Amino acid sequence: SISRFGVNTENEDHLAKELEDLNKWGLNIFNVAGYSHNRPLTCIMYAIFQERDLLKTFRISSDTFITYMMTLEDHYHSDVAYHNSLHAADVAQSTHVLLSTPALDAVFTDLEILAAIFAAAIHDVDHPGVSNQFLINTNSELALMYNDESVLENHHLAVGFKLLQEEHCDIFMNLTKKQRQTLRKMVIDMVLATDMSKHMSLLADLKTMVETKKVTSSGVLLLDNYTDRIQVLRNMVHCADLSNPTKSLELYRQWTDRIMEEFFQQGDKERERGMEISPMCDKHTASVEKSQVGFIDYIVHPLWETWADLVQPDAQDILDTLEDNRNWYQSMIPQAPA
Ligand SMILES: Nc1ncnc2c1nc(Br)n2[C@@H]1O[C@H](COP(=O)(O)O)[C@@H](O)[C@H]1O
Ligand SMILES: [Zn+2]
Numbered sequence: 167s168i169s170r171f172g173v174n175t176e177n178e179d180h181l182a183k184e185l186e187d188l189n190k191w192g193l194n195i196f197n198v199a200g201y202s203h204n205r206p207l208t209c210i211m212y213a214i215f216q217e218r219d220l221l222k223t224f225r226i227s228s229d230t231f232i233t234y235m236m237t238l239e240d241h242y243h244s245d246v247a248y249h250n251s252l253h254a255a256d257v258a259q260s261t262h263v264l265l266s267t268p269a270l271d272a273v274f275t276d277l278e279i280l281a282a283i284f285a286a287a288i289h290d291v292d293h294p295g296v297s298n299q300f301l302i303n304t305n306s307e308l309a310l311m312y313n314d315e316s317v318l319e320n321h322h323l324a325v326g327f328k329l330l331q332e333e334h335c336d337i338f339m340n341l342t343k344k345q346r347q348t349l350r351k352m353v354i355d356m357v358l359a360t361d362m363s364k365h366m367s368l369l370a371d372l373k374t375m376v377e378t379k380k381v382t383s384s385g386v387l388l389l390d391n392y393t394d395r396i397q398v399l400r401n402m403v404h405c406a407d408l409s410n411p412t413k414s415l416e417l418y419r420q421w422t423d424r425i426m427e428e429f430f431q432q433g434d435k436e437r438e439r440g441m442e443i444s445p446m447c448d449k450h451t452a453s454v455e456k457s458q459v460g461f462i463d464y465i466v467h468p469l470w471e472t473w474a475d476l477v478q479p480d481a482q483d484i485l486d487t488l489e490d491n492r493n494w495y496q497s498m499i500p501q502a503p504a
């Protein structure tokens with residue numbers, strides 16, 4: 167309902183043009199936010215749920231959905247440069263595209279599709295713009311509550327679900343009790359998996375699976391048991407979360423400026439509070455280009471090559487873009503050795 171969005175017909179027409187890419191990696195979520203009064207997460211999520219008939223399937227009225235989404239989106243901090251609703255919207259939409267990869271056709275149930283997109287939407291909700299370590303080092307009440315383990319990730323989950331109890335926000339009201347239980351389990355699993363400290367083990371397990379990889383006569387992947395599906399789902403959301411470098415350079419560069427500003431912001435907070443300045447959080451000693459190249463080589467590329475392997479040749483264009491983007495940054499590195 168365009169009215170809940172406060173969008174007039176002219177921006178609705180702009181939005182319509184942007185949403186033509188709803189199912190494409192090339193969608194520009196920045197333009198989406200620009201035409202939706204900066205409610206990219208609710209807009210994109212509504213478009214996604216309509217596109218996949220998830221509202222009909224799970225009996226979620228547009229009212230309940232929009233109410234919950236606008237509430238959730240409002241719990242993302244618009245003053246946090248990277249981990250805001252724009253990033254959540256990007257990850258939800260990226261997850262939406264990844265779910266429809268040829269190699270995974272007919273593999274996931276609707277509840278699993280619902281879980282993955284929900285997970286993506288709430289995975290960074292109420293993010294303060296600082297790392298778990300910063301929260302730990304400052305003796306944050308949040309760190310004490312979660313015993314220094316996956317502090318933010320646990321909090322993102324607690325908030326995403328807690329907001330279902332606000333007025334007209336229970337979008338899972340009509341799922342059976344078993345459905346809610348299963349979705350909760352899967353969502354918790356996928357969001358906890360976004361904790362970068364679990365990356366290596368996620369990748370390790372992911373490779374170990376690409377080995378026993380099974381397909382059909384048409385090439386479609388075969389995932390018959392839960393453990394395997396959830397493992398693919400958790401890695402999928404992780405990949406979407408780490409998809410910035412695989413996007414058109416125009417987009418990637420905007421994501422990089424944001425993550426760097428957020429790091430510098432934390433750097434400022436550490437200086438303000440008399441703490442030692444963390445790595446990559448000092449704008450006067452950080453190498454943006456070197457960082458990206460290093461991030462891609464050791465984290466992003468190793469992840470996406472493995473995902474591309476699992477669903478080959480579906481992710482080939484993504485891998486090519488990733489590699490082009492990496493080399494572009496490697497060339498932009500300030501002309502050393504002098
Ligand atoms: N261009 C980029 N996009 C996403 N994360 C990046 C990044 N460059 C770097 Br360095 N990172 C790091 O990778 C982590 C990924 O976690 P999130 O995507 O959830 O933010 C970031 O928190 C940040 O520490
Ligand atoms: Zn996160």
Ligand SMILES: [Zn+2]
Nearest residue numbers: 253289290407
């Ligand atoms: Zn994220």
